[PDB]
């Protein structure tokens with residue numbers, strides 16, 4: 001290993017955001033501190049000088065952004081409430097408003113977060129698991145945090161993926177979230193602006209490891225059209241990818257890359273097929289320097305490639 | 315799942331102690347507390363009322379005993395020192411003195427612990443990983459806790475298994491310990507009353523997942539004779555067993571039972587091949603009610619069977 005690598009928690013929560021190919025990746029160090037590693041041309045940071053906050057050891061770590069102007073990072077306090085580390089361009093990092101609502105969740109709750117697409121307003125939808133094991137939406141729409149829709153039961157400790165997009169032939173944002181049911185399927189729930197929440201859960205994978213990590217992204221929103229990608233850790237100890245392409249629907253899955261048993265996963269994307277895209281970046285642990293975070297890359301030039309062997313501070 | 319199962323930490327550290335078929339199991343709950351579950355003809359406890367202490371979330375949990383008269387449970391504090399919860403008959407549960415020494419270990423250390431075999435005196439050896447990634451022994455022999463032998467480099471965050479037996483043709487205890495080296499190998503180091511620690515690393519398995527759970531037992535000490543079992547979580551997500559049998563040395567290995575990705579493991583034993591045993595019991599997570607601990611059993615009557623499916627408080 002290396003001294004940097006050793007600072008990184010084994011099975012740390014992982015999250016990432018970006019503006020095109022400007023990248024931020026958050027993880028937890030062995031002491032519980034949440035750090036940010038950074039890529040602008042080259043990889044950097046991720047040290048103890050790069051701490052944005054502290055959270056319970058073993059915390060889930062989620063993030064979403066509007067480019068790199070507005071960033072938000074979600075984790076649990078020791079007392080198992082939802083908190084929020086916020087970055088605003090021209091202000092720097094501070095302690096978000098989420099924490100004051102004291103939203104109490106299961107100790108094993110995971111967390112997903114999205115800024116709603118197609119608006120310049122700041123509209124956040126955060127998802128986590130209550131003590132009754134239901135999935136619960138929390139909204140921020142410019143007058144304070146509140147509970148949104150309850151999307152009902154799931155496997156205790158389930159992974160949670162989420163994404164927002166805006167169809168161009170609609171005048172509101174859509175949302176998809178993914179999670180695990182008691183029978184260990186992975187399913188999607190779905191919100192659209194005319195329909196509201198559809199009542200149905202739609203299987204995307206028949207049987208996955210319990211509490212397996214789930215992460216999602218979307219690109220190329222058009223007219224009733226979208227391209228989605230959901231990733232999870234499978235029984236073979238590799239990340240699997242599951243594709244939605246418009247018209248085909250949920251039409252393929254397969255393996256992508258090897259990970260350590262119980263790795264978390266973060267996904268980001270930019271561009272679309274129209275403009276020599278998309279680009280995809282996946283983050284996870286695969287044993288590099290034992291405990292380092294690693295990167296997998298998809299692009300048009302070279303397709304499916306391992307990226308940065310080990311992220312800062314490794 | 316069950317409101318009881320949901321209380322056990324996923325990938326919790328696990329230790330076990332016994333006198334014959336009188337069993338204690340220790341584990342961590344989602345809040346950080348170390349809880350005891352018990353088997354006296356039937357299985358009980360493991361509730362919020364059965365808490366012997368707190369530890370850093372994610373802590374290793376190791377345990378050793380002199381039958382059930384003296385029990386010692388070793389974990390790490392939030393500040394990464396070795397700590398100890400003590401039970402002596404007639405006294406109850408207390409914090410032992412190990413905490414007092416403020417032995418700092420790598421945040422990612424595991425722990426192994428043994429009482430030396432074949433003396434009524436309480437003689438304790440703990441093994442942990444120091445921040446320089448060597449395995450350090452710590453001793454208690456009635457005169458306060460101190461450093462013992464240092465045992466060389468190991469993979470940052472190796473599992474450590476330990477056992478102590480006494481050959482009857484000898485005047486004191488033998489020790490064996492097991493851990494993982496940077497090359498991913500699994501190795502044995504050995505101590506013997508007539509030669510001290512042998513210099514040499516013996517390989518017991520060529521390549522295991524990094525930081526795999528390792529746990530170990532011995533039974534049937536006679537004249538220059540012993541039996542030993544070592545257990546680990548292999549790349550196929552099952553506990554594998556490595557077999558030392560008197561006359562053959564190390565000579566067999568294979569799979570035993572499936573476990574969840576990154577499960578910890580504890581092993582206890584009693585009896586012998588000459589008095590109609592031995593008896594073995596593994597504890598681990600295989601996914602029963604998601605997060606419950608399960609058990610596996612070997613006896614002469616029925617050999618290999620799963621046992622208590624979900625341990626209390628499940």
Ligand SMILES: CO[C@H]1O[C@@H](C)[C@@H](O)[C@@H](O)[C@@H]1O
Nearest residue numbers: 021023039281295297307308
């Ligand atoms: C072209 O691949 C590169 O894309 C960058 C945005 C960043 O992810 C780098 O680590 C990759 O090697």
Ligand SMILES: CO[C@H]1O[C@@H](C)[C@@H](O)[C@@H](O)[C@@H]1O
Nearest residue numbers: 024036038068069071087093
């Ligand atoms: C240039 O790096 C900065 O980018 C911002 C968008 C945010 O990630 C900050 O934490 C970094 O220091």
Ligand SMILES: CO[C@H]1O[C@@H](C)[C@@H](O)[C@@H](O)[C@@H]1O
Nearest residue numbers: 125137139141148149173191
């Ligand atoms: C305005 O609140 C609504 O926003 C939608 C986008 C969706 O999150 C619904 O659950 C909320 O009730």
Ligand SMILES: CO[C@H]1O[C@@H](C)[C@@H](O)[C@@H](O)[C@@H]1O
Nearest residue numbers: 335336353595609611621622
């Ligand atoms: C025969 O197996 C039993 O042995 C007991 C001592 C204990 O390990 C139980 O959980 C098993 O069912």
Ligand SMILES: CO[C@H]1O[C@@H](C)[C@@H](O)[C@@H](O)[C@@H]1O
Nearest residue numbers: 338350352382383385401407
């Ligand atoms: C009789 O039950 C007790 O057994 C002791 C050996 C110790 O494990 C205590 O924690 C239990 O309450």
Ligand SMILES: CO[C@H]1O[C@@H](C)[C@@H](O)[C@@H](O)[C@@H]1O
Nearest residue numbers: 439451453455462463487505
């Ligand atoms: C008395 O100290 C010794 O005890 C032995 C049994 C063994 O643990 C050695 O490491 C120590 O130097």
Ligand SMILES: [Ca+2]
Nearest residue numbers: 021022040041
């Ligand atoms: Ca740039």
